[PDB]
Amino acid sequence: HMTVFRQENVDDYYDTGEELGSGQFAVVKKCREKSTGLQYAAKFIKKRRTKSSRRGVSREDIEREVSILKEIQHPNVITLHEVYENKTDVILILELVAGGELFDFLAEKESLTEEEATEFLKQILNGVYYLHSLQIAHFDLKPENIMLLDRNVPKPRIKIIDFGLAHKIDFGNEFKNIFGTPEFVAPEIVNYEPLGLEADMWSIGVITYILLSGASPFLGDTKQETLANVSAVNYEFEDEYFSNTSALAKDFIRRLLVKDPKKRMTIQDSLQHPWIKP
Ligand SMILES: [Mg+2]
Ligand code: NA
Ligand code: NA
DSSP, rough: OOOOOOOOOOHHHEEEEEEEEOSSSEEEEEEEETTTOOOEEEEEBBBBBSOOOOOSSSSSHHHHHHHHHHHHHOOTTEEEEEEEOOOEEEEEEEEOOOOOOOOHHHHSOOOHHHHHHHHHHHHHHHHHHHHHHHHHHHOOGGGEEESSSSSSSSSOOOOOOOOOTTTEEETTOOOSSSOOOOTTHHHHHTTTTOOOOOOOHHHHHEEEHOOOOOOOOTEOOOOOOOOHHHHHTTTOOOOHHHTOOHHHHHHHHHSSSSSSSGSOOOHHHHHSSSTTOO
């Protein structure tokens, strides 16, 4: 079921500028479309050079990301404008989100209040509600993959980015090669079990703990420790960080950081939880 993308030179149509993102398999650059002057983010994904290579991204994996992206139109999720390709790269022309990572914002700013945390979290929940309503599991939710529209307002607006691990969950679970960042992955990821929408809900619990405390709940000194911690549900609320945080906030996290995916809050549960619900 593979398709093909526009094979004119991206350079003919766009000018690139500042670098917005860089990872193992992709680089993201601001860009401007010549015909309109509108600005975008160009994500250059390196292709695989042979069938059996570990370097670059398989065409299947690229096309999955593109196909999911084409489905989406919501204020809290990145959208896709165009796709180009050449021998080396697939080039996704994505919506531009220019206010930086939530990761960097958190690093740079004072500790959040519950209101500040919930103003972020509610947007994340709304985006994930959209995705999950479409049976799209993101599988890579973390502060690095939440981008701020404008970092210089009291209550920054966000979009979820980076659909490189996202999958359609049309049979309730998927059982494929899916493994994100140890600090954020759910126990079923760690244990290589079938995965569904529920994994993203665990990640949201981790994000929430971080938003409220500045600390990562499962993080060990090595990746293997972090993974062991996740699987064991080895976290606690430290008084030094949480003494002035409401018990209802803690309840919200506690009901997301649950090993059995069936018992974990769903996205609808999270929206109705008393900490969130009006
Ligand atoms: Mg990305
Ligand atoms: Na345009
Ligand atoms: Na939109």
